[PDB]
Structure 1
Amino acid sequence: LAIVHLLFLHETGSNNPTGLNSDADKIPFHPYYTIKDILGILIMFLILMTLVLFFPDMLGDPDNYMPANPLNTPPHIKPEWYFLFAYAILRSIPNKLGGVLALILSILILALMPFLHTSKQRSLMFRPITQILYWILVANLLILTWIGGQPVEHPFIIIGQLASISYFSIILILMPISGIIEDKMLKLY
C-alpha cells in the first residue's frame, strides 16, 4: 500500500513548508536529500539502539513475561501507548457502540480532513490562529494518551470526556472557522 503511496505522490511531487509552488526552486534528490535521509536514518538508529540496549522495557508492560493465564487477568490492563488514546476515546463514550464508532472516527477523521480545508493558503507557516489550534490539538492528543493510562476514577474520566469533545470539535469545527477568519484578515474573503 505504501508503494501505491509513492506513486500517487510523484504524480504531484512533495510539498514544502511554505506551502507555495516550489517549481522555481527544485534540486536533485541523490546528493541533497539522500545524504539527508542517511543522516536521519543514522539518528533514528541511534534512538532505536539506545531504546534497545539501555532501556529495553520502558515502553512495554512487564505483564508480557507472564505466560497467558487463560484463567487469570492483569489487575491493570492497558493497550500499548501507541493506541492508548484510541482506547481513551472509547472509555469516554458511555455507549459501547458509540465508543467503537468514535474510536474508528478517531482514525478516520483524518481521511475526512481534505474536505475540511477552507483556506486559500495550503500550509500553516503563515497562519498563526490555526497554528494555535493545531498545537492545542497536539496538546489534547497527549492528554488523551495520558488518560488512557490512568485508571477509571475521578477526575480522569471527565478529562477524557472533554478531551475527546475538544479533539473532535477542533478538527471538525474550529479549524475551518479559523481558516475563514484568517482569510478575512488578509482581505481575501
Structure 2
Amino acid sequence: HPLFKIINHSFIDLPAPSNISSWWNFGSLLGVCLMVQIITGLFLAMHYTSDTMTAFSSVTHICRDVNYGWLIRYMHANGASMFFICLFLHVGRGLYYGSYTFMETWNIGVLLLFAVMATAFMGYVLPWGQMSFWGATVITNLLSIGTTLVEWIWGGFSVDKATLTRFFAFHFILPFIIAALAIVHLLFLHETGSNNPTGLNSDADKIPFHPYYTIKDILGILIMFLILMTLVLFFPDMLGDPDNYMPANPLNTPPHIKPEWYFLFAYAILRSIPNKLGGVLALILSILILALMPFLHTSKQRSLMFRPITQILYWILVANLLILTWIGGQPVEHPFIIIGQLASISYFSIILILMPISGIIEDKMLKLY
C-alpha cells in the first residue's frame, strides 16, 4: 500500500542513529503531549462557554458536575506545563548537540515555539479568573501602530467579552496549525536524518526505528505519563496560581501580577529593560535569539560532546536561565532587579559573544584554526 509504504519509510523503517540518548525521546513526547492537549481540549470544549458572565461558572461546572471533568481540566493544565517542560528540554538538546545546523528544521521549530507560547497565553486567559484578566490586559498593551493593534486584538477599549470569545476561537484553532507545522518539521528533518550526541556522521551505524526507538518512545511516554498523573492526581495546584480561583474583578487589582512559570524568563527580561519598547524587543529577541543561533556556529565540531569550554558556557546559560525564571517570580525591589539586569546581560552576552569566541579558542587548541 502506498500510504503504508510511506509510513514504513517514515516510521516503521527509518534509518536512525544507534547511539541517541533519552533526550531524543523528548520531541516525540511533545507530539504526544500535543495530541493529549487536543484531546483534553476537545473534552473541555463540550462544556465551556466563552461568555464573561458564564466562563467561570462553566469551568466550575466542569470541575463539579461533569463526570471526571476535574480530571480532564487538570490534565489539560498540567499537560500544558508538561508541554513546556518537554519543549524546553527539546530546545536545550538542540542547542547542546549542535542540531541547529539543520537550519530549516530549526526555523520551523522556532515558529512552532512562538505558536505554542501564543496558544498557552490565550488558553490561560480562557478560564476568566482574576489572574487571567489582569495578565491579559498587560500583554495586549504590550503590543501598544501600537494603539490600534492593541485595540484590534482586544476588540474594544479594554479586554472584555470581545476578547474572551476571539481568544477562545484562536486558542481552539492554533494547535491544528501547530500540528501541520510539526508535520513540516518532521519533513524538513527526514531529508537530513537525526543527529547523534557525538555529532559525527552516523551513516556507518544506523538501525531501524520500529523495534529500537519505538519501544524506547513507548517507555518515555510511560514515564512522562507517570510524571503527568502524579502532577494531576497528587499536586494539582503546585504550578498554578491561587488567585486564578477568584472571579475576574476589573475593579480589584492583584498585589503581584505574573504569567505562568514558563513565561517567567521572558518576564524577567522585559522587566529588566527600563524602556518599555526595549523590554518588548528584548523579550522577543529572547525567543528569537535562538533562530539567530545557526549563524553563530563557528566551530568545526557539530556537538558539544568533545568541547568542554563551550559545555561550561552552556551550563552557565542554563544556570542564568533558571535565575531569570526565579527573578520573574520575585517582586520589584532590591536586589532582585539588579540580578535581573545582569542575568539578562549575561544571557545575551553568552549566546551572542562568548560561545563563538570559545569555539574559536577550542579550534585553536586542537591545532585546527
Q: d(CA) in 2 for partners of 1:105 and 1:5?
A: 22
Which is further off, 172-181 or 71-80?
71-80
Deviation for aligned residue 1:138: 0.1
Deviation for aligned residue 1:183: 0.1
Instruction: Deviation per CA, 1:42-92: give whole Å up to 9, x if none.
Output: 000000000000000000000111110021111111111000110100000
Q: d(CA) in 1 for partners of 2:254 and 2:235?
A: 23
Deviation for aligned residue 1:179: 0.1
Q: Any stretches of 5+ residues in structure 1 without a counterpart?
A: none
Q: Does 1:61 align with 2:241?
A: yes
Q: d(CA) in 2 for partners of 1:74 and 1:44?
A: 34
**Other structure's SS at 2:207 match:** coil
**Other structure's SS at 1:73 match:** coil
For these two proteins, the number of residue pairs brought into alignment is: 189
Instruction: Deviation per CA, 1:139-179: give whole Å up to 9, x if none.
Output: 00000000000000000000000000000000000000000
Q: Scaled by the length of structure 1, what TM-score is found? A: 0.99
Deviation for aligned residue 1:109: 0.1
Deviation for aligned residue 1:137: 0.1
Q: d(CA) in 2 for partners of 1:8 and 1:89?
A: 32
Q: Any stretches of 5+ residues in structure 2 without a counterpart?
A: 1-180
Q: Does 1:167 align with 2:167?
A: no
Q: d(CA) in 1 for partners of 2:339 and 2:250?
A: 34
Instruction: Deviation per CA, 1:117-142: give whole Å up to 9, x if none.
Output: 00000000000000000000000000
Q: Scaled by the length of structure 2, what TM-score is found? A: 0.51
Instruction: Deviation per CA, 1:2-61: give whole Å up to 9, x if none.
Output: 110000000000000000000000000000000000000000000000000000000000
In structure 1, the partner of 2:203 is 23
**Other structure's SS at 1:31 match:** coil
Q: d(CA) in 2 for partners of 1:157 and 1:170?
A: 20
Q: Which segments of structure 1 move beyond 4 Å, counting only runs of 4 or more?
A: none
Q: d(CA) in 2 for partners of 1:122 and 1:150?
A: 38
Which is further off, 104-113 or 62-71?
62-71
Q: d(CA) in 1 for partners of 2:256 and 2:363?
A: 49
Instruction: Deviation per CA, 1:75-115: give whole Å up to 9, x if none.
Output: 11111100011010000000000000000000000000000
Q: d(CA) in 2 for partners of 1:159 and 1:3?
A: 40
Q: d(CA) in 1 for partners of 2:216 and 2:192?
A: 22
Q: d(CA) in 2 for partners of 1:70 and 1:171?
A: 40
The CA RMSD over aligned residues, in Å, is 0.4
Q: d(CA) in 2 for partners of 1:2 and 1:73?
A: 39
Q: d(CA) in 2 for partners of 1:99 and 1:152?
A: 15
Q: Does 1:80 align with 2:260?
A: yes
Q: d(CA) in 2 for partners of 1:168 and 1:156?
A: 18
Q: d(CA) in 1 for partners of 2:259 and 2:187?
A: 34
